[model samples]
Target: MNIFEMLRIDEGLRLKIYKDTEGYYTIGIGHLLTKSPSINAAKSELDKAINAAKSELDKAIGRNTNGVITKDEAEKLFNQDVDAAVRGILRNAKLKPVYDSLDAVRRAALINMVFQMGETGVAGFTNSLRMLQQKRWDEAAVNLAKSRWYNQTPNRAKRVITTFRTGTWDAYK
Candidate 1:
């Protein structure tokens, strides 16, 4: 599977405003409305839209609303968020060479991790990242398995780790 497909499966699609696992306002394919660059860029427009929908304004702001974006809008936001995630991965000097060395499936796995946890969060896996950079698949997967992320999202983490270990799409596909 491609990066987008993997992300969609892992993150799940939500057209309406909802609270993510961390209690943050999120929408679309894991788009963090409170902190994502795309959300910040469209803040004014969103405010205007929310304001116009007087009946839903309170619910929307409170993150308990039925307010929803069209599929097209959701797709646009998803694309922007994915681009931001990829850029975040590429911008990290330490990860740049590692990312370039990876095959497409492995690259997708890295991007997927960054997409879910942000670049800073993933960077915290120094040992795992070092293992990945060295192309030591088993060592990297073992290191990743020791993280809280593995416990928090076992299924997703397992798939991603397996993808890293095997350097193939079998885990996701």
Candidate 2:
């Protein structure tokens, strides 16, 4: 199959604009609203126009505006967002050097961890990450195990700890 075909299958061709699980506007194989110049910039203009019209009407008839996006337009904006979050983590001065040294699997695990844990939540692992930077893998695992996250999801945490200790993927701990 062609690359575009593969992408369409992987991305799931949805014909309608809809909010993603995190409530971000997405459509036509995961195109983000903010990624669309027409939607993003037009949305700003639409918002202003809506408010102006609302105020004018509110003083008279009382109204605003509502609309729906067509699938064709959404498909035209099918560009996806790159890994901004993971890149943000890698860009950190303290984290960058250490993250850069990790193997592919280890890096992927850490990236997934950031996904499971939001920025604020991942930031909570500062001490453990410093330990990881020091190459104290066992100590880093121990530090992670002691965290509230481990208490909350022991099985998942154990799996991560095993990766830390062994530098390999273990299906489960």
Candidate 3:
């Protein structure tokens, strides 16, 4: 990978995060939120972290990132992005699980959902995570539906919710 390619990656990301949007809110990372001050500040901060992940990729492919990122190495960008993106959404969200011990993968998937749906759905995860924390497996699973997160996809949601209710991670994909 040469300089042009490396630079292109960051450039593309900046444009992508800056321009994308979900139906309810403008979809972007931390910096996108900032460069456009009228935009939400929390989104900007999230972009900042995501952009840093892009920077790491730039360095790995052979470019000067100028110390913009440290959350995850270039190879870990995907997982790091997922986690950071989730954090960004969670930070701006009004109703989120007060609990923060979600597994990284679970958190990433949830954040991915929020990114697409907006905060309208994110505030809904609280009861589910809380139930898990309390070890109320059956009730926790039932409460999973307390939020429309599962409603997004009925079949899939039913399967996972049932699994959570039964303490069977294997029941889900």
Best by TM-score: 1
lDDT of 1 by residue, 14-132 (tens): 87776676645677788776521235547686565444442342333444345676666667778988999899888998777779999888999999899999998987788898889
- Cα deviation at 23, candidate 1, in Å, is 1.7
TM-score-best of 2 and 3: 2
Ordering by TM-score:
1, 2, 3
Q: What is the lDDT of residue 22 in candidate 1?
A: 67
TM-scores of all predicted structures: 0.80, 0.50, 0.37
Q: Which one wins by TM-score: 1 or 2? A: 1
lDDT of 2 by residue, 65-139 (tens): 232334554344443222654666766665566677777656655654554454556766788888877778889
The Cα RMSD in angstroms, rounded to one decimal, for candidate 3 relative to the true structure is 11.3
lDDT (tens digit, per residue) of candidate 3 on 38-131: 3455766656655655564454436655434332333244344455555666575342453255544344334544543445555656666566
RMSD in order of candidates: 7.4, 11.1, 11.3
Per-candidate local distance difference test: 0.79, 0.56, 0.45
